[PDB]
Write a protein that binds this ligand. Structure first.
Ligand code: A3P
Ligand code: CA
Length: 282
């Protein structure tokens, strides 16, 4: 019985009941709900960890929404507090009802060469993921989208369509590394929360990779809270967390090919070009 399975043409972990997934639009959003959206390996925790570190904001951060049985919906309706709800769903599969309420989205994004790698790595090291021997095997799938949650490019695009909607904010991983505070603001703001220089500086302190990397047990109460449906061992996510490495895995060929598909898919995607002003200088 597989480690992965495919729903509507996209691979998912068997830890996402298909029950759960046919049932999504039966999700009943709250005007206030929040969603931290990303394609795998894209700052997810980073982001989510960052949220939790916001003080007395009143927010219960929630286990992934495409993780589990239909009941997860049950699990969800009982959170009396405001919900920040993590997901890697694509737009289409995002619950209509979320579309209908215009719940705020935060969609975080990172250049796709770095994502691929980070990823490949994740296939290697995670027993919920059917490992792949060599880098080049995984890239082919990536470029096909033959990875869980499907094609990078599609994820981003679908999402990018709503980049100019009011309850939506895009964020760039990269931009998190560069000037984390300018970012944080951008958020606090979207969320219309005030948090001061001191405080913001505390979060920065608390959330540094290596900081985030020192860890082994529990959060605010008892049973471990998972935030990425795929991940059960948080110790697995902190690998290198810089920008750039992809220059230590792409062969001149794979790059040419990559840059052409990229340029083919990300035609006139503003976001496209921004991710290019980065490795442009990076
Ligand atoms: N506080 C932090 N600062 C920078 N990068 C971080 C980080 N926390 C996690 N990461 C990076 O986030 C990536 C994982 O993404 P996700 O949260 O979606 O699973 C990893 O990339 P790397 O493989 O390059 O190290 C990890 O290194
Ligand atoms: Ca459209």
């Amino acid at each position: 019985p597989s480690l992965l399975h495919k729903y509507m043409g996209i691979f998912f972990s068997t830890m996402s009941s298909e029950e759960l997934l046919g049932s999504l639009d039966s999700f009943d959003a709250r005007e206030d709900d929040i969603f931290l959206v990303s394609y795998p390996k894209s700052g997810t925790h980073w982001l989510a960890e960052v949220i939790e570190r916001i003080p007395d904001a009143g927010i219960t951060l929630t286990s992934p929404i495409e993780l589990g049985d239909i009941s997860k919906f049950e699990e969800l309706k009982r959170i009396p507090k405001r919900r920040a709800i993590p997901t890697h769903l694509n737009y289409e599969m995002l619950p209509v009802t979320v579309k209908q309420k215009q719940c705020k989205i935060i969609y975080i994004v990172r250049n796709p060469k770095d994502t691929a790698v980070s990823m490949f790595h994740y296939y290697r090291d995670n027993p919920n993921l059917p490992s792949t021997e060599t880098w080049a095997a995984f890239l082919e799938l990536f470029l096909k989208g033959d990875v869980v949650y499907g094609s990078w490019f599609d994820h981003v695009l679908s999402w990018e369509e709503h980049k100019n909607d009011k309850n939506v904010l895009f964020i760039f991983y990269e931009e998190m590394k560069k000037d984390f505070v300018k970012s944080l603001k951008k958020i606090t703001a979207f969320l219309g929360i005030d948090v001061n220089d001191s405080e913001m500086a505390k979060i920065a302190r608390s959330t540094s990779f290596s900081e985030m990397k020192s860890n082994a047990a529990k959060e605010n109460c008892d049973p471990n809270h998972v935030i990425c449906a795929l991940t059960s061992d948080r110790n697995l996510v902190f690998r290198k967390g810089v920008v750039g490495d992809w220059i230590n895995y792409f062969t001149p060929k794979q790059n040419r090919g990559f840059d052409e598909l990229f340029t083919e898919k990300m035609r006139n995607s503003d976001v496209g070009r921004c991710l290019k002003e980065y490795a442009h200088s990076a």
